[PDB]
Write a protein that binds this ligand. Sequence first.
Ligand SMILES: N[C@@H](CCC(=O)N[C@@H](CSSC[C@H](NC(=O)CC[C@H](N)C(=O)O)C(=O)NCC(=O)O)C(=O)NCC(=O)O)C(=O)O
Ligand SMILES: N[C@@H](CCC(=O)N[C@@H](CSSC[C@H](NC(=O)CC[C@H](N)C(=O)O)C(=O)NCC(=O)O)C(=O)NCC(=O)O)C(=O)O
Ligand SMILES: N[C@@H](CCC(=O)N[C@@H](CSCC(=O)c1ccc([N+](=O)[O-])cc1)C(=O)NCC(=O)O)C(=O)O
Ligand SMILES: N[C@@H](CCC(=O)N[C@@H](CSCC(=O)c1ccc([N+](=O)[O-])cc1)C(=O)NCC(=O)O)C(=O)O
Lengths: 238, 238
Amino acid sequence: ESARSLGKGSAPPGPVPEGSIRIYSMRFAPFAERTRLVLKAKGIRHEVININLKNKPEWFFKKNPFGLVPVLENSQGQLIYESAITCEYLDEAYPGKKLLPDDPYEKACQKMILELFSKVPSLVGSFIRSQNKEDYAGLKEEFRKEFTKLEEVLTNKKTTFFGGNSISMIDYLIWPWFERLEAMKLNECVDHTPKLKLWMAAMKEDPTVSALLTSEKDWQGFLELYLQNSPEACDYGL
Amino acid sequence: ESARSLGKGSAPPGPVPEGSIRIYSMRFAPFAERTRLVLKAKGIRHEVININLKNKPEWFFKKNPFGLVPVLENSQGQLIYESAITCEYLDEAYPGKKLLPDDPYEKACQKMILELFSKVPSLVGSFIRSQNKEDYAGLKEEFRKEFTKLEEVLTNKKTTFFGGNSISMIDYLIWPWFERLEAMKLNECVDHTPKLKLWMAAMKEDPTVSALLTSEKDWQGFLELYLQNSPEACDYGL
Ligand SMILES: N[C@@H](CCC(=O)N[C@@H](CSSC[C@H](NC(=O)CC[C@H](N)C(=O)O)C(=O)NCC(=O)O)C(=O)NCC(=O)O)C(=O)O
Ligand SMILES: N[C@@H](CCC(=O)N[C@@H](CSSC[C@H](NC(=O)CC[C@H](N)C(=O)O)C(=O)NCC(=O)O)C(=O)NCC(=O)O)C(=O)O
Ligand SMILES: N[C@@H](CCC(=O)N[C@@H](CSCC(=O)c1ccc([N+](=O)[O-])cc1)C(=O)NCC(=O)O)C(=O)O
Ligand SMILES: N[C@@H](CCC(=O)N[C@@H](CSCC(=O)c1ccc([N+](=O)[O-])cc1)C(=O)NCC(=O)O)C(=O)O
């Protein structure tokens, strides 16, 4: 119940309490899942306000003039948005093991892999609107090209994850789009990419990933409503 | 003469000497100017290899598989690309005053302003191909919308530059597209944005900006050839 989204007409929320940080999110948004994975991995005390993205509160544009999730707001009232920016902010502003490497080159490398990956979210957007078996074959091809590039990174590095043999920031940043791959009927696109397939399996075993994983059933329920343009999609299940 | 670009058929360059870093650049490329402004501002010893982007050396794709400038290569053979990534790398890997703030929020802010600005390079690409007075009026409008957003940042901050009252990373990252504004006949788009106009004037007074500024005459010579699709554009003037 408490997870229900805030939409048009809702009262603006109060101040974030000292000792917590707040994320404005939506339970099915992969960009916000990045930020939540980082919050979870670093053990950062936080609250979540879900936003009805189909019927947004007017006040939400005071949080982010772009009107998008994720957004962080801290107890000092500071606002941070763009998922990758929010993630690096958390890594720097909070204690515990650092998800990004301290080494400048290794850090730059993670950011270059993110750029390599950056076509995938737009492709997923397109697959979700694919109309027939002809479109779907073409989509499968574009994903295959993209996935072969990621395979090459793992091949060159000889490690299970993209930043080393332990999970790190870059893995959490790309994960949410792979999470949805099964549902979108694109789990055959990883057939030519064996290291990437192993990576997926290893990601699903990570405690932070597992804790935040959404079931096939729930994602499908959301997708059905989202594509029906329903103002209740964001609250699928409740 | 030494600044002449390397193109198809050129021998791959040798190793970068210990104590220097190398930038693969092109004298008229605004994305590479970012990196050169940072090299200059931090006093970093470096060499430049200009790339003929119309007729690229095959070996350049071993430096950057995307085939784009800028690219950094250091004496250890490490390769970094994407202009913003190269700039942050230099700020972290070399001594001297830091162009990016140490504070996580203030740093995240610079990155958010960069995202705010990020439509402008694609617009400049479009203006350069604008065909008549009707297209040009429409372009002027899109720039005006974008420039009003940047004006708002300076208004909210009450400082001459985008990261404070002293020049910092964010200013150097956005400067190269404003440098070209005069030439593109878009210097009237800043009429409604007075703080942004003052910013331009202050940028031109910066020693690092001034040292790297290209004259109206030379940019025009390059543009003329670039749009004529000439393999000699990159070496305009020599
Ligand atoms: N560069 C930004 C992008 C952030 C972004 O796009 N956020 C989305 C979160 S939903 S994540 C991205 C996108 N989903 C959406 O755009 C949802 C749109 C909303 N439901 C509406 O009603 O308009 C998507 O492709 N999901 C994959 C899938 O459906 O399987 C958002 O808030 N959109 C609101 C809007 O566009 O107005 C970042 O990295 O943070
Ligand atoms: N995201 C990357 C973008 C880098 C990028 O686009 N680099 C350009 C440098 S030229 S800077 C960007 C672009 N110029 C060009 O694309 C030049 C293309 C080349 N001359 C050719 O022959 O294809 C531009 O719009 N300039 C404004 C102007 O002309 O006034 C490049 O190497 N292009 C090679 C290519 O596309 O194949 C980054 O930030 O580094
Ligand atoms: N619109 C802009 C592009 C916006 C953009 O690309 N942002 C970066 C992320 S913002 C940069 C940053 O500061 C950062 C912080 C942390 C990490 N990291 O943790 O690895 C990496 C980069 C990115 O790689 N976007 C692609 C994506 O987010 O999928 C344009 O048209 O040019
Ligand atoms: N293709 C991608 C977008 C690529 C991208 O947006 N890169 C960042 C820059 S890369 C992030 C980063 O790590 C960084 C490093 C330094 C600074 N800074 O010094 O301020 C900021 C961000 C950016 O803001 N691009 C916009 C631009 O470069 O104009 C996509 O489709 O999503």
